[PDB]
């Protein structure tokens, strides 16, 4: 099954955050399944599921592992305040559309 491993956990309280690198080990699976992985990270730490994000997923040749960048928050308010809009329209709840002209 899908197993997770955090490494190099640092605390950035200036952005009120804790950021780390994620080894995602999936044997005979398709790939990471980012949402289910975020639920697993929400479970392995304190919950904050709409405050946790992972973005830097790179699989390796032949499968097996993937390396990404995880960053858990406290306080979904500052998750909205600091996590940028493109990641928020990917995962969270902000959405911005533009008047495309010219």
């Amino acid at each position: 099954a899908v197993t997770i491993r955090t490494r190099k956990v640092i605390s950035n309280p200036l952005l009120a955050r804790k950021q780390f690198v994620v080894d995602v080990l999936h044997p005979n699976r398709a790939n990471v399944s980012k949402d289910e992985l975020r639920e697993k990270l929400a479970e392995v730490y304190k919950a904050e599921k709409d405050a946790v994000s992972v973005f830097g997923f790179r699989t390796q040749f032949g499968g097996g592992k993937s390396v990404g960048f995880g960053l858990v928050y406290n306080s979904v308010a500052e998750a909205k305040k600091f996590e940028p809009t493109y990641r928020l329209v990917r995962y969270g709840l902000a959405e911005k559309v533009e008047k495309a002209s010219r």
Binding site: R7, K8, Q19, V21, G56, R58, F61, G62, V67, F69
Partner: protein, 134 residues
């Protein structure tokens, strides 16, 4: 005359005298082990590459450690990659057989005239050579 700041006068160049022959001898006679990988994970495009060179795996270690040290994926900057990546894979597939490069034996670069035969401590007096021997 007068003093001018110069990063090229106290900069770590350190590549004008690194030769793979000398480093290969130092690695042979070091008596400290050398952190080889698991034996499958080093070949690249299911074999369509090489295995990969030693310069390649140290550069790759630097890229992934810089990656895990300041959180940034690189790019497809086209002028840079259209020179260096295609030239890198072309010299790799011409010279690197079995993961070991052999271009160092088919390229003119004088080993003694940059790597051995020290220059500052050249011992240009017989008193100096006797003292430095003893």
């Amino acid at each position: 005359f007068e003093d001018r700041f110069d990063a090229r006068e106290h900069k770590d160049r350190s590549n004008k005298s690194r030769m793979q022959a000398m480093e290969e001898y130092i690695r042979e006679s070091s008596d400290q082990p050398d952190w080889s990988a698991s034996i499958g994970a080093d070949i690249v495009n299911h074999g369509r590459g090489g295995i990969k060179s030693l310069r390649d795996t140290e550069k790759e270690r630097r890229v992934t450690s810089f990656e895990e040290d300041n959180f940034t994926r690189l790019n497809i900057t086209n002028k840079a990659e259209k020179r260096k990546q295609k030239q890198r894979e072309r010299n790799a597939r011409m010279n690197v057989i079995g993961g070991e490069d052999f271009g160092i034996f088919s390229s003119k670069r004088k080993l003694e005239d940059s790597t051995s035969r020290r220059g500052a401590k050249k011992t240009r007096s017989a008193w100096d050579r006797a003292q430095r021997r003893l």
